[PDB]
Amino acid sequence: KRINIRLAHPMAPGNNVTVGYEKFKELVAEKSNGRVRIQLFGNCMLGSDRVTMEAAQRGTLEMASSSSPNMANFSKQWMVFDLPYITSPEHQQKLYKAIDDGELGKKLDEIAASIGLKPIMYSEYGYRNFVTTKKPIKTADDLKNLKVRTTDSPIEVAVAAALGMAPTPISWGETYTALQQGTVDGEGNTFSLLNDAKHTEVLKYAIDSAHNYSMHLLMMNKAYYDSLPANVQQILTEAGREALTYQRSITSELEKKAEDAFIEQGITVTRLSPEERAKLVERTRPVWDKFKDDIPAELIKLVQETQQ
């Protein structure tokens, strides 16, 4: 008989994370010949990121996807991935290998288990970049005294302050108005979300700072997973792994298209010099020692090992 598995997530139609979960649904159906069906509830149809991951943890929902910074609200260990410049785009393929098949992946499995969850896909969300409405930013010093919108992430706030910026936490929904009306000067996010949300209408400058990395973590209730037949577990695990291959590639392509939409809209996108990138790394590194006591050294080391 048919197994119906509900999957909740916060992302909008056509979004890189959404299309990965569509691939997941398609592969689960193919592999199970229709016996297992993923029912998608995107765009917060079942709740916010937090509401749906609590339901998955508790066992009233089978699967949910949460951003890595939002997972820090269930377990602080996930904060390792938010540290400034802990990873960079140049080493992304080795990061994926470590998560997919390596000791990093296994430790993350254990951490999820301790809060009632089984990881199924580590969806790529991307690297955040600083953008501004009116003030040109081409250098590290250009960032000093910028009023910048932040999320509620303590690491995001610390990074802004380390760079001499003035951080203001503002909900996503209030951020367009804050930029338009001038209560902040800028923000930091992926080019794809900024363009998709039409913030580009009010922006004029961007730098490829890549000062924050994140993922969207698709989790299954672990007790539920452990209740399934071996062959169904295998279907889910394999569909996840294969959908992720596609999702990581689609993310790259959508980010290129987002960056082109920026240029088309007259936004000046500065490619930081090695000298200027180095200053952002150096200025932000004290943030790691500030949060040292809250993130396990072993986990920092496993992530750094992917970068060299």
Swiss-Prot record:
Pathway: Organosulfur degradation; alkanesulfonate degradation. It catalyses: 2-hydroxyethane-1-sulfonate(out) + Na(+)(out) = 2-hydroxyethane-1-sulfonate(in) + Na(+)(in). It is found in: Periplasm. Keywords: Periplasm, Signal, Transport. One of its GO terms (biological process) is alkanesulfonate catabolic process. It holds the Pfam family DctP. Induction: Highly up-regulated in the presence of isethionate. The keyword Cytoplasm does not apply. Its main location: periplasm. It comes from the Bacteria. One of its GO terms (cellular component) is outer membrane-bounded periplasmic space. Disruption phenotype: Cells lacking this gene lose the ability to grow with isethionate as the terminal electron acceptor. The keyword Ubl conjugation does not apply. Part of the tripartite ATP-independent periplasmic (TRAP) transport system DctPQM involved in the uptake of isethionate (2-hydroxyethanesulfonate), which is then catabolized by enzymes encoded by adjacent genes in the locus. The DctP subunit is the solute-binding protein. Thereby is involved in an anaerobic respiration pathway that converts the sulfonate isethionate to ammonia, acetate and sulfide. The complex comprises the periplasmic solute receptor protein DctP, and the fused transmembrane protein DctMQ. Belongs to the bacterial solute-binding protein 7 family. This is Isethionate-binding periplasmic protein DctP. It comes from Oleidesulfovibrio alaskensis (strain ATCC BAA-1058 / DSM 17464 / G20). The gene is dctP.
